[PDB]
Ligand binder design. Structure first.
Ligand SMILES: [Mg+2]
Ligand SMILES: [Zn+2]
Ligand SMILES: [Zn+2]
Lengths: 1340, 69, 99
């Protein structure tokens, strides 16, 4: 077998087919049915295809392997292995050239549009009912003229010569050979230069592309017509002899026999010179037989002999699920594997696993035999089986000897992420259960309640090495999703440690001074001192402050005995402070974090193991239990309940009198009950938490209690405050089916007893919860499957592309404070360019450097706010990404290595965690800082307010040391108090505006003048008396009256004299087209003040994430501006009002249709910026990408997804979402010209290579400007370049025909192709292999 | 058992062709064409080859020079 | 339950499914993705050919293990070669390139 790549597909020429074939099959007979020896040329022939049985001739003269080239004199069969009879192909020489059904009848008829003649006509021709005049020389008839019988007759009699017409695939081949490719191509290009109409231009461009595909690939059309037909090896269409003289045969045998029969009958008829009609009928019949062979089902459906079932053609074997690919290389059962239940086994090391004897023997059986034979304990293999089935001591010794370093793979049924499969070293144990190390359970999501686990054995040596290096448990401590440790202690360990570190006011051995931890242990273990008691101890901590040297600092600290006992394990490098605290879940996690970051892997591993052992031991010594008295009912519960009941009774009686609606009463009751619940919860937590008032020597004191349930709560081992409440408080309000909340809550708790109603309600609750979880899991699985499918092929191919591009990343400060800081957001990304201190020429970070913890810390002491970092989306590399643009983050710490398939890890990391996802009047500065306004242009009025005239105005907050803490968006018309520079005290009201009201603010004073403000047609004067009330209504486009639909009323602001007063600094005559719902309250006759109100203008979780990733237009998209400049109205009331954006500089002709219902937020005579909001609502990603560009859409996607994910408190690094987005926009659409067809959707890769070519060519071209496109992951995956990956799941016939005609070349470049072809994936360990082969080409 | 290969990956930073060179070495060791340069402690040949890699005696270039020699 | 080697199925030469008959574990597509997230190319290679479906491959691997050597001999899966012959049996020229 050759080591290949680049699988090439093209039309087979008849000479190549002759090349493959080894012989002609002349007669259809196979075997004599009497003596089961095969016949001569037949369909089964030993001299043509091969010997039936390995290395033995038919007559039985030669049977030994010694003979390999001899050809028996009696039977002319050569002696070789029967396997060759499986690969040798034959051929049949057809007398009449026959058409290939696939390339003719396939839905887009490539013969059809290539000849630009419809399919109906081709069918009409093929069945011989009418002729067609093909190149009828110098007469008055065209090339696709249909001819009837007697019209053909009178034509022949009139035109003896200059009349050439024919029938069938030979006629079609004649038409194809004589067609002039280049003349028609150039004519078509001229026509396209002259023609401007959509559908004809599309059919023409498709056709020109087809012709171009032929002229580059080099396939000539005549090969679509078959002359020689190959015949499949016999063993793939067997004719097995059933016991009982009967035979069983595949349908291919029947089809071949029928084809050969019909061919031979046609041969004789030709030799007999039969009339044309009969030979035509026979040629048609041969057509049905052949096309039934190739693809049965596009004709009269030739059924088989005496069976009424349609016979299976070649296409059926290839195409379809049951046939091949879709099932063949998709999900199989493997060997050397077992399955059983998992168990704890605390005594194990982190890198090992308990394995039952009997399973180990069964798995490693062949290893056992090999080693037993090597040691000579057994003469032969059968003796090895007998000795293993007796199971003597030698067998266990050999098994122990082979097992030492051999690792096994453990897998748990739902492998959500890559930590679902890990390798361990087995330790033989008794029993039938697998023993699993506790720390890794969190990674597996394993639970000991009957969960089972599977165990695989890697066979080859490379697999063993891969398991020990890449997959071993100790090498995978950091989650690939986020950087934090996965193996953190879970529940028992943390409880034990918590018990160990907590101190008590007074105990045994108070205040004695110890020389070290060793005598602390002496004291505790001998019972001369309590495990927790405050003491002065001398301790020597080590610090590697120098360049890797450890300096001992030795002093007296005040701690507990327990903390010292714990200190024994702690590795050298860590500061003592680390253990000095209460040491809960978080504390332990951050301890492990620091230990890893400072020391490295191995010390962290050993330290984690030590932590486990000590935690388990001292938890057991603690003796923590749970008694009925451990959960204390708060003493003041009953009072709270009686008070709340009295209050609900008073509110209900005051309802029966009818001063409050039903809904209002509902709201009041629900709120008062919620308040009572919070009160009782807080009272219970106060009672239980710090109730231990124990006494020291003299007076008394109080301390954090030793209530066992409280320790289980506070340590973070199990339970949350909510469950404590659910045990000892009232279990809050419940929701009915529809989501509405029951008026009376459940006042009882599980310590007490519920009654029928309350129980029933909670039953409903739990049922709904579980069903939700079920459906959520199904939806998750579906989403993650799509994700992993679409992004599989992306691989890190290059080290550095060398681009300067990058994205400016800032900390996302949503409103009140810094939800997520910079340091975590930037850790492990390379910088796009050096960032400067707040003072120029103070470079803080050289050109691209990997930002590890030390650089990040350096950035917090300074005040860098925003950092431009290289992102994967902007990466320049072709066909993959470069290491630098990606960054470091991995289960290991260092920069990414060339070759790892980041697409799949990203898809898994985004998918697996997805299974637990279900007024604004005044601004209030939270922290004392300076206020700063961004993107605003205000005009101070007479009242002394900084009037906001921009809709996109932002108000950020600079702190003392130059950092933006808070950020708010201030709308148009919000009353302001402080401007710029002013320091605002804590929680001081800086702004004011009406929540459900946006006022329109006048800048100047004077009298209101009516322009196009006619009474009655478009407005209805409903005015009140002297005090100046009115109901003048300037209605919007939808709500405008029927007469005043197109007449737009306006208000010019003139002064007392008449002249329109102009806005300060601008000459524009203020002509305010009153917007929708302009309630003109202040009628004509009141000098307008600056600020009169002109017009009052009034899902999440898994479906939301799936929707973001499928890019679905949300049915009410907001509208944006393309260019800036004066907008204007246009041809009025066609059914959708026209808005034409007029650029002050640019060209005018941009029209946007607007529905009637739409209300506009901007005035006509307003200064818009590009991409400003015109209507309110959710924006569809396409517009943002088109206008603002790539970085805007990527930021948009990342923020909306990361919001959903953080709402549930699951941390994911942005790089994965970035990789997905990069995979999403692979395609572009060409807008200019020069080398493409001026509109074809083409991948950005081909565009980049062609631009590199053109611009490299000195003459080159003007060059092809393009526009990006965004496609949804399902369709985007469906638009896969590889023909193999497309065939893997869609209609196989179509893509196979398309790639065959196009001559497409697949470099396989991906995962799925390599799987299908059965070679090494180009990722990871096999990358080198492929790298080797790449080095193998163009080398010595 | 050799619980971490961190030093071997620090020798060759790709962390993938590490597996290839170690496989070639351990395959020369199992089919007894060659001999281990490190005193074995009852390890199998995989962990032996990793132990040899981490000590700096073997890499791809040493393999190539020794093979042509 | 565990199996090293045992009876295989009639039509598709995969190991029987079940507990009564020895039966192997189902290596599903999700597990393939998990392994692919690692750089584990050789494990997948044996998993696809040597462990289940390739007859000659399984017997050769058995013999090699019995001999006390733990290697393997790579190459194109015969099922893939069968694929080449079946696609080539149509009027489609599909060639194995070389450089
Ligand atoms: Mg369970
Ligand atoms: Zn013979
Ligand atoms: Zn790059």
């Amino acid at each position: 077998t050759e080591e290949f790549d680049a699988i090439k597909i093209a039309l087979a020429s008849p000479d190549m087919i002759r090349s493959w074939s080894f012989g002609e099959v002349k007669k259809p007979e196979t075997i004599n049915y009497r003596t089961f020896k095969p016949e001569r040329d037949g369909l089964f022939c030993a001299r043509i295809f091969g010997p039936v049985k390995d290395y033995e001739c038919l007559c039985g003269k030669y049977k030994r392997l010694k003979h390999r080239g001899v050809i028996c004199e009696k039977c002319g069969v050569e002696v070789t292995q029967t396997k060759v009879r499986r690969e040798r192909m034959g051929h049949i020489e057809l007398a009449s050239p026959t058409a290939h059904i696939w390339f003719l009848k396939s839905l887009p008829s490539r013969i059809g549009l290539l000849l630009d003649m419809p399919l109906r006509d081709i069918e009409r021709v093929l069945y011989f009912e009418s002729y067609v005049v093909i190149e009828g020389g110098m007469t008055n008839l065209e090339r696709q003229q249909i001819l009837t019988e007697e019209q053909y007759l009178d034509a022949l009699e009139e035109f003896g010569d200059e009349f050439d017409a024919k029938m069938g695939a030979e006629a079609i081949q004649a038409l194809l050979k004589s067609m002039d490719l280049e003349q028609e191509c150039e004519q078509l290009r001229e026509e396209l230069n002259e023609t401007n109409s959509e559908t004809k231009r599309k059919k023409l461009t498709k056709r020109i592309k087809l012709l171009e595909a032929f002229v580059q690939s080099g396939n000539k059309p005549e090969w679509m017509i078959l002359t020689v037909l190959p015949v499949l090896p016999p063993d793939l269409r067997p004719l097995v002899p059933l016991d009982g003289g009967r035979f069983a045969t595949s349908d291919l045998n029947d089809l071949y026999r029928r084809v050969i029969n019909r061919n031979n009958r046609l041969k004789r008829l030709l030799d007999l010179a039969a009339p044309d009609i009969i030979v035509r009928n026979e040629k048609r019949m041969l057509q049905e037989a052949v096309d039934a062979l190739l693809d049965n089902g596009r004709r009269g459906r030739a059924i088989t002999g005496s069976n009424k079932r349609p016979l299976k053609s070649l296409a059926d074997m290839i195409k379809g699920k049951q046939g091949r690919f879709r099932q063949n290389l998709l999900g199989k059962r493997v060997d050397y594997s077992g399955r059983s239940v998992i168990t704890v086994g605390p005594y194990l090391r982190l890198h090992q696993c308990g394995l039952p004897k009997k399973m180990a023997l069964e798995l490693f059986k062949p290893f056992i035999y090999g080693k037993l034979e090597l040691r000579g304990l057994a003469t032969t293999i059968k003796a090895a089986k007998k000795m293993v089935e007796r199971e003597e001591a030698v067998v266990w010794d050999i098994l122990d000897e082979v097992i030492r370093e051999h690792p096994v793979l453990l897998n748990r049924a739902p492998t959500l992420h890559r930590l679902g499969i890990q390798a361990f070293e087995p330790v033989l144990i008794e029993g039938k259960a697998i023993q699993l190390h506790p720390l890794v359970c969190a990674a597996y999501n394993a639970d000991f309640d009957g969960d089972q686990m599977a165990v695989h054995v890697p066979l080859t040596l490379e697999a063993q090495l891969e398991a020990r290096a890449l997959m071993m448990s100790t090498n995978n401590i950091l989650s690939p999703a986020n950087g934090e440790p996965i193996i953190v202690p879970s529940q028992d360990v943390v409880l034990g440690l918590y018990y160990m570190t907590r101190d008590c006011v007074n105990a045994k051995g108070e205040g004695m001074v110890l020389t070290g931890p060793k005598e602390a242990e002496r004291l505790y273990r001998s019972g001369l001192a309590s495990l927790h008691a405050r003491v002065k101890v001398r301790i020597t901590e080590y610090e590697k402050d120098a360049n890797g040297e450890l300096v001992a600092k030795t002093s007296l600290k005040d701690t507990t005995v327990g903390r010292a006992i714990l200190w024994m394990i702690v590795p050298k490098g860590l500061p003592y402070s680390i253990v000095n605290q209460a040491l809960g879940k978080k504390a332990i996690s951050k301890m492990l974090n620091t230990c890893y970051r400072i020391l490295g892997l191995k010390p962290t591993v050993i330290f984690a193991d030590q932590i486990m052992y000590t935690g388990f031991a001292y938890a057991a010594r603690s003796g923590a239990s749970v008694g009925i008295d451990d959960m204390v009912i708060p003493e003041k519960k009953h009072e709270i309940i009686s008070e709340a009941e009295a209050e609900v009774a008073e509110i209900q009686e005051q309802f029966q009198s009818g001063l409050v609606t039903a809904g209002e009463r509902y709201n009041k009751v629900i709120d008062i009950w919620a308040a009572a619940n919070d009160r009782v919860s807080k009272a219970m937590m106060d009672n239980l938490q710090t109730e231990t008032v124990i006494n020291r020597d003299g007076q008394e004191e109080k301390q954090v209690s030793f209530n066992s349930i409280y320790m289980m709560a506070d340590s973070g081992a199990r339970g949350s405050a909510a469950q404590i409440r659910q045990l000892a408080g009232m279990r809050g309000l419940m929701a009915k089916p529809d989501g509405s909340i029951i008026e009376t809550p459940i006042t009882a708790n599980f310590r007490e007893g519920l009654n029928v109603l309350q129980y029933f309600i909670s039953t409903h609750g739990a049922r709904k919860g579980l069903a939700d979880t079920a459906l959520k899991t199904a939806n998750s699985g579906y989403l993650t499957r799509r994700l992993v499918d679409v992004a599989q092929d992306l691989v890190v191919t290059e080290d550095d592309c060398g681009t300067h591009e990058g994205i400016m990343m800032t900390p996302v400060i949503e409103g009140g404070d810094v939800k997520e800081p910079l340091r975590d957001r930037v850790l492990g990304r390379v910088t796009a360019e050096d960032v400067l201190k707040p003072g120029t020429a103070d470079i803080l970070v050289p050109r691209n450097t990997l930002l590890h913890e030390q650089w990040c810390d350096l950035l917090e002491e300074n005040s860098v706010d925003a950092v431009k970092v290289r992102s994967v989306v902007s990466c320049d590399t072709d066909f993959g990404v470069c290491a630098h643009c990606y960054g470091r983050d991995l289960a290991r710490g260092h920069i990414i290595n060339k070759g790892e398939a980041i697409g799949v890890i990203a898809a898994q990391s985004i998918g697996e965690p997805g299974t637990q996802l279900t007024a604004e009047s005044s601004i209030q500065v939270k922290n004392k800082g300076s206020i700063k306004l961004s993107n605003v242009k205000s005009v101070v009025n007479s009242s002394g307010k900084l009037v906001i005239t921009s809709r996109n105005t932002e108000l950020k907050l600079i702190d003392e040391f130059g950092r933006t803490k808070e950020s708010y968006k201030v709308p148009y018309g919000a009353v302001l108090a402080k401007g710029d520079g002013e320091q605002v005290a804590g929680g001081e009201t800086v702004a004011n505006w009406d929540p459900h009201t946006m006022p329109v603010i006048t800048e100047v004073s004077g009298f209101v003048r009516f322009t196009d403000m006619i009474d009655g047609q478009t407005i209805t004067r409903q005015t009140d008396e002297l005090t100046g009330l009115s109901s003048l209504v300037v209605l919007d486009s939808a709500e405008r009256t029927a007469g005043g639909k197109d007449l737009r009323p306006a208000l010019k602001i003139v002064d007392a004299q008449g002249n329109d007063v102009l806005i300060p600094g601008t000459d524009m005559p203020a002509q305010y087209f009153l917007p929708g719902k302009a309630i003109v309250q202040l009628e004509d006759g009141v000098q307008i003040s600056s600020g009169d109100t002109l017009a009052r203008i009034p899902t999440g979780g898994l479906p939301r994430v799936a929707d973001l990733f499928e890019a679905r237009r949300p049915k009410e998209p907001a509208i944006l501006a393309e260019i800036s400049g004066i907008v204007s109205f246009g041809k009025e009331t066609k059914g959708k009002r026209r808005l034409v954006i007029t650029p002050v500089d640019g060209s005018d002709p941009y029209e946007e249709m607007i529905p009637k219902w739409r209300q506009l937020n901007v005035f006509e005579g307003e200064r818009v910026e590009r991409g400003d909001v015109i209507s309110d609502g959710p924006e569809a990603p396409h517009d943002i990408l088109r206008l603002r560009g790539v970085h805007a859409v990527t930021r948009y996607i990342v923020n909306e997804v990361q919001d959903v994910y953080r709402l549930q408190g699951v941390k994911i690094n942005d790089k994965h979402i970035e990789v997905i987005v990069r995979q999403m926009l692979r395609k572009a659409t060409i807008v200019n010209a020069g080398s493409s067809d001026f509109l074809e959707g083409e991948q950005v890769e081909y565009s980049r290579v062609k631009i590199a070519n053109r611009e490299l060519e000195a003459n080159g071209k003007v060059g092809a400007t393009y526009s990006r496109d965004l496609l949804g992951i399902t369709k985007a995956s469906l638009a896969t370049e590889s023909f193999i990956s497309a065939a893997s799941f869609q209609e196989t016939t179509r893509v196979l025909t398309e790639a065959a005609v196009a001559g497409k070349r697949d470099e396989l470049r991906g995962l799925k192709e390599n799987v299908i072809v059965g070679r090494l994936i180009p990722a990871g360990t096999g990358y080198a292999y492929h790298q080797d082969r790449m080095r193998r080409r163009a080398a010595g | 058992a050799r619980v971490t290969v961190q030093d071997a990956v620090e020798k060759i930073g790709n962390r993938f062709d590490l597996v290839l060179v170690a496989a070639r070495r351990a395959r020369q060791m199992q089919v007894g064409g060659k001999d281990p340069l490190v005193p074995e402690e009852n390890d199998k040949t995989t962990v032996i080859a990793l132990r040899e890699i981490e000590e700096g005696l073997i890499n791809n270039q040493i393999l190539d020079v020794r093979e042509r020699q | 339950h565990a199996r090293s080697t045992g009876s295989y199925s009639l039509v598709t030469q995969q190991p029987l499914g079940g507990k009564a008959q020895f039966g192997g574990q189902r290596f599903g597509e999700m597990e393939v993705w998990a392994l692919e997230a690692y750089g584990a190319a050789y494990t997948l290679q044996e998993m696809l050919t040597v462990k289940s479906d390739d007859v000659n491959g399984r017997t050769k691997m058995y013999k090699n293990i019995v001999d006390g050597n733990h290697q393997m001999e790579p190459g194109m899966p015969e099922s893939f070669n069968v694929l080449l012959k079946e696609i080539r049996s149509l009027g489609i020229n599909i060639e194995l390139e070389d450089e």
